[PDB]
Design a protein around this ligand. Structure first.
Ligand code: BTN
Ligand code: BTN
Lengths: 126, 117
């Protein structure tokens, strides 16, 4: 792969790439030829659980847009939580690459079922 | 409750969208989404869906391109299982990503899926 060449999420078709957000959480995504997204997310987000373990990641990317989800369970830690990202590619004028996302986090607290929301921007890294 | 492994299940939301999901051994989710939301594109044909369920939580993703019709957008839902009075409900927040005349926008809202056997 090359960030120079990056056109849209088609530029990933058949590539392995690592992406860090502003919280230092890292996803390592395998994009297949037909736009299927598999790999692992590492939460390193302060203030939150299940940090620094691999969590299975599945989604799809087409054109400028991408959606993917994690359930926070692998048989090691369970945070009783699932997270979903939808977003679009952004090409930096510096010739790097970004994914701008809204994430939804669903969990069941002492107060029962609840749904927290926010933004992550992931920057391509090697 | 989402701990479904071995079988398909059919869910329908307040917008009258249908999804049918296969939950593997791990808690992985494949299947198709069928949208019929008032005022949206890509209504009535199926789109691939991927995600994961475990315990009282699930998350799944649909890109709206199936080789037939493309609305150049993607949705992810995250949700929690609410027990009603046999069929479990999935209460969810969805984010919808599209690039338009005002570039990348990301709209949000809530969906309740209802089970059917
Ligand atoms: O604490 C939990 O309930 C489980 C881990 C949550 C990590 C969240 S997902 C939203 C945000 N983005 C990240 O990369 N980390 C946090
Ligand atoms: O209009 C588009 O960009 C493609 C179809 C999107 C359908 C949305 S996804 C959120 C909401 N929930 C549904 O079941 N349908 C709409």
């Amino acid at each position: 792969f090359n960030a120079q060449g990056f056109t849209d999420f088609d530029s990933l078709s058949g590539t392995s790439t690592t992406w860090v957000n502003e919280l230092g959480s890292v996803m390592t995504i395998d994009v297949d030829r037909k736009g299927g997204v598999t790999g692992y997310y590492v939460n390193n987000a302060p203030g939150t659980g299940c940090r620094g373990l691999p969590y299975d990641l599945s989604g799809h990317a087409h054109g400028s847009t991408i959606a993917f989800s994690v359930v926070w369970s692998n048989g090691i830690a369970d945070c009783r939580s699932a997270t979903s990202w939808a977003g679009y590619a952004r090409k930096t004028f510096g010739g790097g690459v970004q994914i701008v996302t809204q994430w939804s986090l669903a969990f069941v607290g002492k107060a029962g079922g609840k749904i927290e929301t926010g933004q992550n921007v992931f920057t391509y890294q090697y």
